[PDB]
């Protein structure tokens, strides 16, 4: 139980009851007011009783220490969260951060030595691409002194403090919660220069020397402060070293300093203003509208709410409101359009509010207990559109016919003859005579998709406790009685993989028969949701096992069946409407959904199935449960006798968000279409994330002004909005005018903010998240340095600067290595690696500049700056290393050490499941290994009938044997082996074991039950120590491969590397089909301006991409049907190839996949001739001609050797990084030539039609007929 480190990043909510409980048990005074005094009263009565355990004793001792130290300070005052935010953001100590300061000073003195060469190596790449001969003299200074910029920031000392405290408390928690030693020493204050710390295991006490203020914090608050400050430091550095954000820096700094000044005064309600910067960033983008009547429409509501919050809080004065409004005006008002979605990235950096259960239960009870008055005529007019959509969706795909479809009763003439003639009908007829669909009875014409996969059940979910024990979540401390013990399990996978008799039809009948309404164990509970900036905000609901299974089954049915029917001179002009769907699922009563659930009952043939949710909720009780907010109950009572009070919501009517999402989404389109018909406009809806948009569209004459076109296209939707609002209010829904936007230009979605063909992306959202330790279960430097480099590459595509992001990655990697070496809580870091590595400075930067596919710890190579996917990691990392050695960042001997390093020990299955892996010693991820071990164990030991007969303990040996048979030939093909093994029944098992997302609790349970041995525990408890030892050996080793030089191509280097790396499985046999030349080394460039003649063109090359851009002010505006797992057999048999004899083996494996004969297989496979842009703003102006680039190796009837899109992505990249700082595209039209040269990169190969299988084919004794495994009865 020691391979689990405490949490490093924030993942839970900040509950004020938690701090109140800790302090009230530690007997410390505190100025914390609670909405419900039930927790305090319970703890008080429990103390008067005499209950106490080890936690109470430890907290009492820490409280005694605190109360004894508080005597030296006469006027101490507890400053509660969030009132202490302005102080604790700028706290700084000089005698407590004495260690991390020296650590980071050394980490900065190393970068100060490598930075001149880093800049030289980036300037080489720039000049080679053809952007001049010298970087900007500003970029040079920033790249070189990037460490001094990061160190002379206002958040650096708070960062050091909140990292020291975080790691110290993490070490305390880790070394304490382990049951090895129990005798504990009391923790004493650490008197620093300006503050005094007490880092206990539960709470931290910070006293301020000069101010006398006192703060008490918990682990969640420490994690949140560390996260906030590590985000602010990274974003401020990334906006300081950058020039495009020169105007945004002042606005963001003023926003920080202005909203920090409200925390001491306003308090917790300050997040109701912090959470007003997402709507304001759109209300201030509407002020650039083209229909002046709309400017201010949303801003009026935003300012009204910002005034109401101040008034209710108490700041009734007008001066404060006026200064606040002027400040917000200055902050948000700007000129550049692409810098309007940036303030979106920063509204999560003020911290998260402290929330309780009462104030989040009342907010949902208010909406779920509320009468409504729907209107039958419009309800049926929407139901008519529903029936019409179903009619058309079945008449299509079936050649215009209604064989099992509707049977009207008194239908009109046209709508009765449409069925006879077998023709469809548009919205017009349905809304015109909706009386014809007033009694239509369908008939079952939709099969039940049953054994697709196990996604729904396997995906980790929580379960509520059985209704008979609903208060087992509350520990015995905070309760006024002894709660009943918890028998059942508390996870969907833990109750699913133990189901001795599971049946989806058993569940469907558990709903149909109607036993879910008499089940004496059903229970629904609410749980507060972490990392939200609204005190009420959202909760997530947990329900019992059988009901959750029926819910996921119903949703899968309604998403796989009719849910797919609803997917979809004069010019067209479209406006946009955007409204959020929060609090939009509580206005869904049974009356307004029965007419749509009934047609689906009659379509799927499931009597009274699809309306289970409301029939079950309307007679149940749902409480909001968190362990620290107990109910006020002197004795245990059933969930039916609790009154309607703080945490309970008795007998709701509305829905629950997430459940019946497809049902509500397909039942909400009929009213959009009715309101569109009633106005004569064509609409298109899109629910993306948490807010739905509607693109109302109308046809207008072409010879019209753009202004008048957009004005009329906005008028039509200003008319449509009121119609739609009336319709939704008649069916029962409130389409509020405050929380909604109408605009002729933009609409929000989940990839940024679309604005009139552009995309105002937010580039500083991932820089604020490239924090030190990555999300994992054990602190591992490899995963940390991979998450550090996987976010800079995302900021680069969202808009950041390539060179500055690369330098930021290098610096953060260099100091992450040092933090993991000499500032870690790990106990296996020994002086045989810590001391030599920390002492040798050159080696420590060599290991941080060496790429990861080679053996180093640098995961961002200079080709990932430009292209999205690099060709081959091993042949691109060697090109990167050659570039570094040339620019003199690393010595020449590093290449020889790389090429003669120590080969690891990996089998054939690992090479088949990772085909680009030049095998390395101790490189894999401990988290991934523990997942792939525990998932396999728990799937092998499971009596579940759904996956039985598939996970036998010999599956590992069978997988290794199949991989050996596939790979071992006279010519090795790892990519084809990977494809075959992935599509086979040995890849299906791994896909299921990956879908089975194991949690920290599940791995804890596995260790408790003995899932893995103590030998595996000791092998994976000291992994990173072996990473550092292997790196030391790699960089110290003094060998030489006389046949290695800097001039040999990177392709040849990677081939030699793989051959020498595993000749033990190759013995000289050629590995084939992996190496593809590096794009940045293979492609040179040149920029033709107004009057000049190309030079690298006339030097001889005739193969080059040609890009063009004109001059104009822009950058502001302008036997085989319904396929199944048989597809797996087909793609496998094509990946195998066309063989005279080995077609038998291909048929054998495809038969083990699916049941089919050799002749049908050969006639179904498509035998081939062989044997084997939404991110930038200057791509609109750009014109690309691929003619001259068409020259490839013989340009025969094959695929492009290099990925043809690379020579275009790398041209758009350079054009964007040229026009990155310009407002116009110049005065003269510019051209770009992108010559390529892959001469020595061509593999001299022998075209083998196919290789003879030099190993005997041994498979499973008999292909199991498990229907989840690829089907064995297609026809």
């Amino acid at each position: 139980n020691q391979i689990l480190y405490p949490e490093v990043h924030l993942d839970s909510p900040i509950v004020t009851n938690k701090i109140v409980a800790i302090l009230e048990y530690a007997r410390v005074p505190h100025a914390y007011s609670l909405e419900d005094p039930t927790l305090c009263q319970n703890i008080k009565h429990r103390l008067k009783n005499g209950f106490s355990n080890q936690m109470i004793i430890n907290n009492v001792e820490v409280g005694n220490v605190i109360k004894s130290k508080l005597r030296s300070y006469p006027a101490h005052s507890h400053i509660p969260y969030p009132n202490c935010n302005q102080d604790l953001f700028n706290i700084e100590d000089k005698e407590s951060t004495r260690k991390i300061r020296e650590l980071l000073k050394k980490g900065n003195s190393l970068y100060s030595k490598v930075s001149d060469k880093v800049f030289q190596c980036l300037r080489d790449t720039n000049s080679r691409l053809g952007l001049g001969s010298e970087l900007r003299e500003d970029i040079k200074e920033k790249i070189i002194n990037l460490g001094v910029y990061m160190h002379s920031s206002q958040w650096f000392e708070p960062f050091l403090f909140w990292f020291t405290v975080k790691t110290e408390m993490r070490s305390v928690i880790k070394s304490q919660t382990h049951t090895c030693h129990r005798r504990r020493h009391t923790p004493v204050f650490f008197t620093g220069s300006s503050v005094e710390l007490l880092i206990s295991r539960d709470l931290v006490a910070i006293i301020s020397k000069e101010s006398q203020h006192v703060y008490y914090l918990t682990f969640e608050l420490v994690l949140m402060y560390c996260d906030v400050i590590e985000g602010r430091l990274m974003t401020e550095t990334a906006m300081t070293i950058d020039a495009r954000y020169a105007e945004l820096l002042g606005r963001v700094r003023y926003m920080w300093k202005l909203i920090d000044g409200f925390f001491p005064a306003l308090g917790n309600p300050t997040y109701q203003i912090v959470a007003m910067l997402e709507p304001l960033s759109l209300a201030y983008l509407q002020l650039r509208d083209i229909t002046v009547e709309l400017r201010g429409a949303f801003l009026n509501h935003c300012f009204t709410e910002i005034h109401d919050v101040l008034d209710q809080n108490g700041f009734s004065d007008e001066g404060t409101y006026h200064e606040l409004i002027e400040a917000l005006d200055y902050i948000f008002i700007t000129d550049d359009i692409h810098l309007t979605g940036e303030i979106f990235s920063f509204f999560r950096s003020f911290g998260h509010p402290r929330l309780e259960a009462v104030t989040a239960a009342e907010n949902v009870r208010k909406y779920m207990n509320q009468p409504k008055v729907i209107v039958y005529e419009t309800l049926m007019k929407g139901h008519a559109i529903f029936c019409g959509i179903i009619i058309n969706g079945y008449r299509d795909r079936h050649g215009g016919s209604w064989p099992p479809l509707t049977l009207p009763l008194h239908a009109a003439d046209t709508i009765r003859n449409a069925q006879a003639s077998g023709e469809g009908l548009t919205h017009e007829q349905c809304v015109d005579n909706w009386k014809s669909f007033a009694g239509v009875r369908f008939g079952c014409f939709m099969p039940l998709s049953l054994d697709s996969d196990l996604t729904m059940y396997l995906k980790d979910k929580a379960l509520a406790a059985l209704q008979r024990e609903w208060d087992s979540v509350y520990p015995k401390e905070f309760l006024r009685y002894d709660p009943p013990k918890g028998t059942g399990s508390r996870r969907l996978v833990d109750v699913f993989l133990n189901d001795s008799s599971f049946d989806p039809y058993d569940m469907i009948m558990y709903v149909v028969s109607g036993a879910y309404l008499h089940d004496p164990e059903f229970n629904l509970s609410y749980s507060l949701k972490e990392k939200e900036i609204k005190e009420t905000g959202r909760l997530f609901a947990k329900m019992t096992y059988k009901m959750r299974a029926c819910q996921v089954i119903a949703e899968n049915l309604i998403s796989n069946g009719i849910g797919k029917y609803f997917k979809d001179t004069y010019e067209t002009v479209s406006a946009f409407i955007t409204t959020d769907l929060k609090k939009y699922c509580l206005n869904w009563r049974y009356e307004t959904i029965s007419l749509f659930a009934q047609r689906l009952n009659e379509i799927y043939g499931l009597p009274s199935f699809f309306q289970w949710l409301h029939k079950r909720l309307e007679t149940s009780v749902l409480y909001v449960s968190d362990p620290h907010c107990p109910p006020d109950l002197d004795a245990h009572v059933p969930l039916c006798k609790v009154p309607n009070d703080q945490i309970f919501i008795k007998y709701p009517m509305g829905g629950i968000e997430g459940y019946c999402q497809k049902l509500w989404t397909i039942s909400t389109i009929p009213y959009l279409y009715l309101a569109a018909y009633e106005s004569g406009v064509r609409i298109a809806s899109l629910v993306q994330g948490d807010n739905q948009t509607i693109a109302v569209t109308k046809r207008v004459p072409s010879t019209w002004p753009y202004n008048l076109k957009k004005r009329e296209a906005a008028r039509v939707t200003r008319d449509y909005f009121v119609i739609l609002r009336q319709r939704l209010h008649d069916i029962g829904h409130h389409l509020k005018a405050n929380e909604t936007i109408v605009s002729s230009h933009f609409f929000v979605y989940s990839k940024g903010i679309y604005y009139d063909g552009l995309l105002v992306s937010q580039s500083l959202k991932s820089i604020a998240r490239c924090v030190f330790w990555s999300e994992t279960i054990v602190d591992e430097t490899r995963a940390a340095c991979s998450n550090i480099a996987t976010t800079m590459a995302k900021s680069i595509e969202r808009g950041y600067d390539r060179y500055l992001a690369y330098s930021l990655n290098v610096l953060k990697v260099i100091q992450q290595i040092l933090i993991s070496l000499g500032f870690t809580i790990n106990s296996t870091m020994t002086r045989d690696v810590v001391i030599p590595l920390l002492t040798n400075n050159d080696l420590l930067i060599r290991m941080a500049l060496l790429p990861a596919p080679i053996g180093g710890m640098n995961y961002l190579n200079m080709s990932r700056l430009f292209v999205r996917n690099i060709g081959d990691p091993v042949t691109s990392s060697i090109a990167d290393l050659k570039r570094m050695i040339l620019a003199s960042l690393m010595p020449e001997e590093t290449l020889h050490q790389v090429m003669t390093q120590q080969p690891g020990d990996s089998s054939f299955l690992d090479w088949a499941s990772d085909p680009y892996s030049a095998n390395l010693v101790c490189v894999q991820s401990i988290t991934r290994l523990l997942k792939n071990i525990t998932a396999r164990f728990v799937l092998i030991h499971s009596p579940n009938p759904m996956l039985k007969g598939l996970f036998h303990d010999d599956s590992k040996e069978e997988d290794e044997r199949l991989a050996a048979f596939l790979m071992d030939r006279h010519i090795i093909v790892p990519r084809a082996a990977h494809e075959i093994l992935d599509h086979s029944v040995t890849g299906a098992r791994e896909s299921i074991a990956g879908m089975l997302d194991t949690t920290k609790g599940l791995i804890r349970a596995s260790m408790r039950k003995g899932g893995l041995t103590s030998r595996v525990i000791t092998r994976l408890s000291n992994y990173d120590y072996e990473q550092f030892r292997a790196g030391m050996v790699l960089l110290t080793g003094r060998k030489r491969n006389v046949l290695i030089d800097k001039e040999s191509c990177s392709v040849q280097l990677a081939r030699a590397l793989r051959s020498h790396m595993w000749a033990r499985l190759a013995r000289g046999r050629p590995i084939y089909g992996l190496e593809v030349p590096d794009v940045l080394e293979s492609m040179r460039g040149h920029l033709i301006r107004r009057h000049e003649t190309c030079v690298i063109c006339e030097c001889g090359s005739v193969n080059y991409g040609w890009f063009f851009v004109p001059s104009g002010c822009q950058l502001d505006d302008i036997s085989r049907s319904l396929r199944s797992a048989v597809r797996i057999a087909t793609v496998y048999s094509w990946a195998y190839g066309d063989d005279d004899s080995s077609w038998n083996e291909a048929w054998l494996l495809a038969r083990q996949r699916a049941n089919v004969s050799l002749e049908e297989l050969r006639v179904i496979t498509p035998i081939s001739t062989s044997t084997n842009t939404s991110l930038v703003r200057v791509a609109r102006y750009t014109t690309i001609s691929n003619d001259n680039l068409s020259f490839v190796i013989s340009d025969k009837k094959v695929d492009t050797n290099f990925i043809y899109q690379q020579g275009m992505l790398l041209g758009l990249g350079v054009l964007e990084t040229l026009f990155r700082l310009e407002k116009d595209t110049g005065s003269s039209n510019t051209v770009l030539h992108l010559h390529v040269e892959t001469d020595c990169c061509v593999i001299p190969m022998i075209d083998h039609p196919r290789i003879p299988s030099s190993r005997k084919l041994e498979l499973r004794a008999e292909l199991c007929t498990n229907p989840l495994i690829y089907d064995n009865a297609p026809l």
């Binding site: 207990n369 509320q370 729907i374 007679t619 007998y651 709701p652 009517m653």
Partner: peptide
Amino acid sequence: INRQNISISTLEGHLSSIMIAIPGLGKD
């Protein structure tokens, strides 16, 4: 019959537009 036809059709005319009142509590 000549009068009963309209006397019964007015019933459908009035019933084709009604208001459904949904309560606030599922049990009451």
